[PDB]
């Protein structure tokens, strides 16, 4: 029953609908995770839920002014947590979230990446390593390999 | 309603659209650079950054988000004799956005079968590998 | 609203006719550069991105795109009879009207109908200036039959 | 439960990192580590690049001294919170010094059952095992592991 | 008319030619650099831009247009024992321009059969692939003694 | 002329003394500032010597490495060398003893040596001469185990 | 007139100086003097050395220079350094190949060793830059 | 007493200085002195060291220098460092190969080991830059009596 989601540490709300978040909800989340210093940049750049989920190292450094690699790592650590527990129902008709989660709960974080390229359960069998890296933004080879393996052993008949 | 005929748009219609999507700040650049429908549909990251002065990667992403919407719900009938728009749309509504890319290289339904992955990327401007692969696959099996 | 004359003998154009065409397509701003650089028909037909940017001072990629849009139109409807003995223009046009634009590129390398069968992909790209892969592939395919 | 023998570095907060820096004679860097908000997780995952550029440790020699201390800490740390399959003891059985790679492997979501499928590239790029000799030994031993 | 013996041209004849083709502007550079017939025939894009100060790619294209004409209608007899000029010309009049490139490497009719594509490009300065291919083809269908 | 000096356990002060003995007192300050002890001395690279210790001349670096090689040849490695690789390397060629710390720092011992590759001896262990690498590798494949 | 069998390998600075005058390169006498160019160095001169060390900035001027040097190399006496008379061997193939003598003998090649030479060796070690020349020299070397 | 072949491996700074004077490189005496070049370092000198550390900016000057050094290397006495007499072995192949002696013995090669040497080793470890030379030395090494 390892549910730290009922803990005080974890940002509120739990199970948030990040894809539909607007600037204001992004602002709230930055405060909770101790990144208030970056509120102004995120506001100016008009980061909403969709952009937050799609944020890259490059955008974070150049457009949002987060110069430290260590600070970016802290940021992505928080964003990965958010992505892991987010509600993707609006954008995830085939429930790729659960498919990824069944492989490993920490793979749920890739949901928006996969649905953003127009992948779904039916198409997943045909996905390539290149696609998972370039299109879906899965940077860890270990993760790519596991997802790829499981995708090839899917029943599409 | 009726879908706008973006391929035939002039500078003035492009200006109107920029206002509607909250990109008024860029009206002057678009005017100076004489962006019409054809050029708007064919706009690249590079042109947006260097020639139109949109320095932020995030702002460009917001812009392309709006442009993709426009491309998705545009009327291509003047330039799309074989109705590639509907073919793409039937595969996935999101693929309609690639209509102008394909017709600009002189592709139509009949020629589509012969297209390569490189061609869809370099010539047609389809950047997502997933999209390329699906379009390629479907093209070979209509043959 | 199409620039006059239609169906022009662009290969034989001098500086003056290039000047007139620039006016018609709304590029009067560039008349001075074209004049200074002494662009005639032959040079206009062979103009590259690089020459347009560096030597003619067209700094914007979007402006260059507008320019090439107009140049492509001119090339598509031009009369190549003086330089195209084997009528490659009609051969290209029969494949797709849009391919007629490549006429000068092919005849400038000394290609004709009879030699076309032997041409390579590299040759069409580097020597003939056919930049679109789709176009190269179609032209290559049709050339291998004849 | 006051003082543990093997420190729970994965669960360390900024303050414990600060204390450790003092003990190892790197007080000079306390401010940078504080400003950059280095906790246990970030300490364990620190790279050459971060140390030089973000923490301002310009000398390669100074960085070597730092990593000498970090490697010791990593070798004797308690990973129980984050290491369900006890990869620490698996690595340790091969060579005590290899226990230092625990956090690198568990951070990618590797465990004993997944070890058989791991590639040399993955050990280098994803897990941060830079010494070829170490990679080769770990790879060899992993080939005799049972998968699912 | 008379075909000029460009291989044997001196600076003065090069100067005259520049005037005739409307490149008087460049007379001084060509004089300073001591361009004779041999150097004129062997002139590269690089030399034209850097050493002779012809900055514009368009201007360089105009120049090479004139040089190609000259090369097409030059007399190569002093340096072309085996008459490669006529062999090239028979293939296509426009190929005569490559005479000096071939004879400068010590090629002749008898050696031509053995030549490689790399050699035609690097050693002989034939830049157009189409031209190279045609010359190569015709060389292989010669007399092989 | 030190007899079996225990360089792996040397502190800053012993490194300082050594620098004096070999006529490199000029570099005492940098070595002090950088806190070079025995372990760091044995693992010193060309890069660290140039950039961190301010030894700009390649010729001076060569002189320095000539002295370091001597020290490494005669050092006592007993604290870090449980399988006595030092004697094994020395028996092959006295000049190979200098590679002891490179090998034991990667956790190698007599029993493991056979599995090492030429790339590993270069990249991991710092054996720069190919001739040396090849000889060590060959002898390692033919050695007696338990 | 045109010098008969000059012993360029044995030339000293003074002879190099004289030759520069004769070919109309007096402007460069100072550089060649300062750099102490003798016969051996003249025969081994590279594009790089000519540009950077001798100050001959123009590619066209360098081309003129090498045109003269090639002539000199073609007519030189190599007897001091060419025991097996590779000069005459090369010359018999084509008079223009004589220019490569010093390149070959400087690597310690002779008639007897020539058969074993590789294309790479002729290019990198001997400084024969023209492929056409390399190929012909290689061919003839295999058949003697 | 004066030896015929100089014992360059054993030369000290003072002998190097003398040699520089004799060959007309007095201009460089100061640099060589400051850098403490002895026989060992002189024999091992590289293009890079000569340019950067000794201040010999001209490639032509460096060529003159190496011309002199090659002669010295060819006729040097290597007996202190060449127990198996590789000098005579190389010399028997071609007198000019004797110049590579110090390169070979510095990697710890001798007659008995020579059979095992690779092309890469002769280039990278021994500093034999001429392909022609490498090939001849390699060939002769393979066909030796082990």
UniProtKB/Swiss-Prot annotation, chain C:
Q: Per UniProt, what does mutating residue 132 to D do?
A: Slightly reduced ability to form an octameric ring and promote axonal degeneration following injury
Q: Which residues of the full protein are shown?
A: 400 to 545 of 724
Describe tissue expression: Predominantly expressed in brain, kidney and liver. Expressed at lower level in placenta.
* Gene Ontology molecular-function annotations: identical protein binding; NAD+ nucleosidase activity; NAD+ nucleosidase activity, cyclic ADP-ribose generating; NADP+ nucleosidase activity; signaling adaptor activity
- Consequence when changing residue 20 to A: Does not affect phosphorylation level
Describe the effect of residue 114 to A: Does not affect phosphorylation level
Major localisation: cytoplasm
Subunit organization:
Homooctamer; forms an octameric ring via SAM domains. Interacts with TICAM1/TRIF and thereby interferes with TICAM1/TRIF function. Interacts with MAPK10/JNK3 and SDC2 (via cytoplasmic domain).
| Family listed | Belongs to the SARM1 family.
| SAM domain span | 13-77, 87-146
- Reported effect of changing residue 94 to A? Does not affect phosphorylation level
* Organism annotation: Homo sapiens
Induction description? Up-regulated by lipopolysaccharides (LPS).
List keywords of the entry alphabetically. Cell projection, Cytoplasm, Differentiation, Hydrolase, Immunity, Innate immunity, Mitochondrion, NAD, Neurogenesis, Phosphoprotein, Repeat, Synapse, Transit peptide
One of the GO BP terms on file:
negative regulation of MyD88-independent toll-like receptor signaling pathway
For this UniProt entry, what's an example GO CC term? axon
Impact of altering residue 28 to A? Does not affect phosphorylation level
Q: Kindly list the places in or outside the cell where this protein is found, as annotated in its UniProt entry.
A: Cytoplasm; Cell projection, Axon; Cell projection, Dendrite; Synapse
- Provide the function of this protein: NAD(+) hydrolase, which plays a key role in axonal degeneration following injury by regulating NAD(+) metabolism. Acts as a negative regulator of MYD88- and TRIF-dependent toll-like receptor signaling pathway by promoting Wallerian degeneration, an injury-induced form of programmed subcellular death which involves degeneration of an axon distal to the injury site.
Protein name, please? NAD(+) hydrolase SARM1
What's written under domain?
Answer: The TIR domain mediates NAD(+) hydrolase (NADase) activity. Self-association of TIR domains is required for NADase activity. The ARM repeats inhibit the NAD(+) hydrolase (NADase) activity by binding to NAD(+): NAD(+)-binding to ARM repeats facilitates inhibition of the TIR domain NADase through their domain interface. In contrast to classical ARM repeats, the last helix of ARM 6 does not fold back to interact with the first two helices, but instead turns towards the N-terminus of SARM1. As a result, the two following motifs ARM 7 and ARM 8 reverse their directions and lie perpendicularly. Moreover, ARM repeats interact with different domains not only within each protomer but also of the adjacent ones.
Q: What is the effect of changing residue 12 to A?
A: Does not affect phosphorylation level
UniProtKB/Swiss-Prot annotation, chain E:
Localization per Swiss-Prot or TrEMBL: Cytoplasm; Cell projection, Axon; Cell projection, Dendrite; Synapse
Q: Please list every transmembrane segment annotated in the UniProt record, as residue ranges.
A: none
Q: What outcome is documented for mutating residue 145 to A in this protein?
A: Decreased phosphorylation, leading to reduced NAD(+) hydrolase activity
UniProt KW keywords: Cell projection, Cytoplasm, Differentiation, Hydrolase, Immunity, Innate immunity, Mitochondrion, NAD, Neurogenesis, Phosphoprotein, Repeat, Synapse, Transit peptide
State what changing residue 61 to D does: Reduced ability to form an octameric ring and promote axonal degeneration following injury
| Effect seen on changing residue 78 to A | Does not affect phosphorylation level
Q: Which residues carry this modification: Phosphoserine?
A: 145
Question: Is Cell membrane one of the keywords UniProt gives this record?
Answer: no
- Result when mutating residue 104 to A: Does not affect phosphorylation level
Post-translational note: Phosphorylation at Ser-145 by JNK kinases (MAPK8, MAPK9 and /or MAPK10) enhance the NAD(+) hydrolase (NADase) activity. Phosphorylation at Ser-145 and subsequent activation takes place in response to oxidative stress conditions and inhibits mitochondrial respiration.
Q: Name one GO cellular component term.
A: glutamatergic synapse
GO BP term, pick one: nervous system development
The effect annotated for residue 137 to A is: Does not affect phosphorylation level
Q: What is known of its domains?
A: The TIR domain mediates NAD(+) hydrolase (NADase) activity. Self-association of TIR domains is required for NADase activity.
Protein family (similarity comment) = Belongs to the SARM1 family.
How would you summarize the oligomeric state and partners of this protein? Homooctamer; forms an octameric ring via SAM domains. Interacts with TICAM1/TRIF and thereby interferes with TICAM1/TRIF function. Interacts with MAPK10/JNK3 and SDC2 (via cytoplasmic domain).
Record-given protein name: NAD(+) hydrolase SARM1
Species in which this protein is naturally found: Homo sapiens
Q: Corresponding gene? A: SARM1
Q: Which residues of the full protein are shown?
A: 404 to 548 of 724
């Amino acid at each position: 029953r390892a549910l730290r989601l009922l803990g005080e540490e974890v940002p509120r709300p739990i199970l948030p609908s990040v894809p539909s978040w607007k600037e204001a909800e992004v602002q709230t989340w930055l405060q909770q995770i101790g990144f208030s210093k970056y509120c102004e940049s995120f506001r100016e750049q008009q980061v909403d839920g969709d952009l937050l989920l799609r944020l890259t190292e490059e955008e974070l450094q150049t457009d949002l002014g987060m110069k430290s690699g260590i600070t970016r790592k802290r940021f992505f650590r928080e964003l990965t947590e958010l992505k892991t527990f987010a509600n993707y129902s609006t954008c995830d008709r085939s429930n790729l979230a659960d498919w990824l989660g069944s492989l490993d709960p920490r793979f749920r974080q890739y949901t928006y990446g996969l649905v953003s390229c127009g992948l779904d359960r039916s198409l997943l069998h045909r996905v390539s390593e290149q696609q998972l890296l370039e299109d879906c933004g899965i940077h860890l080879g270990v993760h790519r390999a596991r997802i790829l393996t499981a995708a090839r052993e899917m029943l599409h008949s």
